[PDB]
């Protein structure tokens, strides 16, 4: 269908609310903060449209089509030009569905959650801004213009981590959770500039062609094209939580629970995996990187696995579990069969967002019995045994954690089984490690 030249309104769809609240939140602080719950409706509705404008954009791709892209020159000066615009390929629609669905759901869950709080409107503004930035990142034509959104989602995650900005730990975790992905985007920018010098272009349609086939022989650049790509891989690592850079997710889970469920299934996985999956056409000419990706995957996998043990904080053990799960995606990408890695990511997104929301509900349910205190709540050793008291929020936790463990009828099973098969088919060297972690997680 021709429903593409109007698709550019997707990443800009919720924006007409954000600027219409922040202004009110800055100029007239005592009026907009009195239309408290009403402000939820114009947002959850608007973003909703995006979702129904995405399935029809994705169903087409399912029926078989050709991807489009639109480029516009936003600089014409002396001796070069700069472009912007987006593209709609299978992966774009996949991540689009996966972001807008969890977004429209976590918005309602937040309306339920943050109802006694004070920063209601500011919270909604932050959520909508992060959402309209992520929706922008996933649909982006040339490298420079994805870098323009990478750091935006980084800043959004920063502002969301230290949300309450008054708990003296949430003031010491946001800084780290910013500096880590700052190192990541540093590596990303260096790799971008390297590939630019090497190939002379910025867009994929030309980069994938030039870098693969035509390049001079060992004028030293070979070492550069081995090095520069490692920097892009380092950025994609740091936005996710792999071995060398994982120290920001466990403590970053200090923020509010809905944000803890949106920065562990919506951005933590997307900005990490998605970029590597899109740049895969490049890495097939660099077997070294194909091996190093698999190695860091099967390192961070086992490391995240063996740290969920004995961690008696639910909103912390969940983060360790989701890092150990992203290990599996990082491994699966390192063997070519990403067609199952994306499926595993789609399953794990929901299978973890459900658990985070359930944990938030359990905390707020038991929080009146023990004092209003983290580590006095959310510490499941003085909690324990709630099947009798809150059933409707218990069956969901069970049927999510079993799916995550791996059972045929449920989800998150047909994906990790396929990727374990492919791992064993590659080599036992870390196939055995994958097989062992597949049981440690079930534990």
């Amino acid at each position: 269908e021709h429903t593409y030249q109007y698709a550019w309104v997707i990443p800009l769809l919720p924006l007409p609310v954000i600027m219409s609240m922040g202004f009110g939140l800055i100029l007239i602080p005592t009026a907009t903060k009195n239309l408290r719950r009403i402000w939820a409706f114009p947002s959850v509705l608007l973003l909703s449209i995006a979702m129904v404008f995405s399935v029809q954009l994705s169903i087409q791709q399912i029926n078989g089509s050709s991807i489009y892209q639109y480029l516009w020159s936003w600089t014409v000066n002396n001796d070069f030009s700069l472009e912007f615009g987006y593209l709609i390929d299978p992966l774009t629609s996949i991540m689009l569905i996966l972001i807008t669905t969890v977004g429209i759901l976590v918005l309602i869950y937040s309306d339920g959650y943050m109802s006694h709080d004070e920063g209601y409107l500011r919270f909604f503004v932050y959520i909508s801004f992060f959402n309209t930035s992520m929706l922008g990142l996933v649909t982006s034509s040339n490298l420079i213009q994805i870098y323009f959104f990478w750091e935006l989602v980084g800043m959004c995650s920063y502002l969301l981590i230290g949300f309450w900005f008054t708990r003296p730990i949430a003031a010491s975790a946001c800084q780290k959770a910013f500096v880590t992905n700052r190192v990541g985007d540093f590596g990303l920018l260096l790799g971008i500039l390297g590939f630019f010098w090497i190939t002379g272009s910025l867009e994929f349609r030309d980069l994938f062609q030039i870098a693969n086939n035509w390049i001079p022989n060992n004028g030293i650049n070979s070492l550069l094209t081995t090095l520069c790509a490692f920097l892009l891989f380092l950025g994609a690592v740091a936005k996710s939580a792999q071995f060398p850079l994982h120290v920001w997710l466990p403590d970053a889970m200090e923020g509010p629970t809905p944000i803890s469920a949106l920065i562990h299934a919506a951005t933590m996985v997307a900005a990490g995996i998605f970029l590597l999956a899109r740049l895969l056409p490049l890495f097939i000419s660099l077997p070294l990187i194909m091996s190093f990706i698999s190695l860091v995957g099967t390192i961070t996998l086992f490391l995240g696995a063996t740290l969920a043990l004995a961690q008696r904080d639910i909103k912390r053990s969940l983060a360790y579990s989701t890092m150990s799960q992203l290990g599996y995606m990082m491994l699966a990408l390192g063997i070519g069969s990403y067609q199952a890695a994306l499926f595993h990511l789609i399953t794990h997104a929901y299978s973890k967002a459900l658990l985070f929301l359930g944990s938030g509900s359990v905390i707020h349910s038991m929080e009146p019995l023990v004092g209003y205190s983290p580590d006095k709540s959310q510490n499941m050793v003085l909690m324990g045994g709630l099947r009798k008291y809150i059933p409707i929020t218990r069956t969901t936790f069970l049927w999510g954690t079993l799916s995550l463990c791996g059972i045929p009828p449920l989800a998150c099973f047909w994906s990790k089984d396929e990727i374990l098969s492919n791992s064993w088919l590659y080599s036992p060297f870390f196939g055995i490690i994958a097989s062992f972690t597949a049981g440690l997680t079930a534990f």
Binding site: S65, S66, I67, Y68, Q69, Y70, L71, W72, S73, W74, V76, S81, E83, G85, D89, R205, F208, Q209, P281
Partner: protein
């Protein structure tokens, strides 16, 4: 135009165009000649720079006035003279 790239692993084709504000870079500066409206938001009341909890108007006056200590030593000398 609408060039149709048959890439070696997928099903691309693209369409691009060049745009740039022709000369409205003058009109936007003329509109941003709204700093001549910086007079309604200056005649408004001052928050506390006119409040009774303020006396001394320099950049270090109120902070480093702070030499009534000398005057107090002098008052001590005078009281001793009394």
């Amino acid at each position: 135009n609408q060039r149709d790239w048959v890439v070696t692993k997928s099903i691309w084709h693209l369409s691009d165009t060049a745009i740039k504000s022709f000369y409205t870079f003058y009109a936007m500066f003329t509109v941003w000649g709204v700093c001549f409206f910086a007079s309604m938001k200056a005649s408004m009341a001052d928050p506390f720079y006119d409040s009774e909890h303020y006396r001394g108007q320099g950049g270090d006056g109120t902070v480093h006035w702070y030499y009534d200590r000398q005057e107090d030593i002098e008052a001590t000398a005078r009281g001793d003279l009394l």
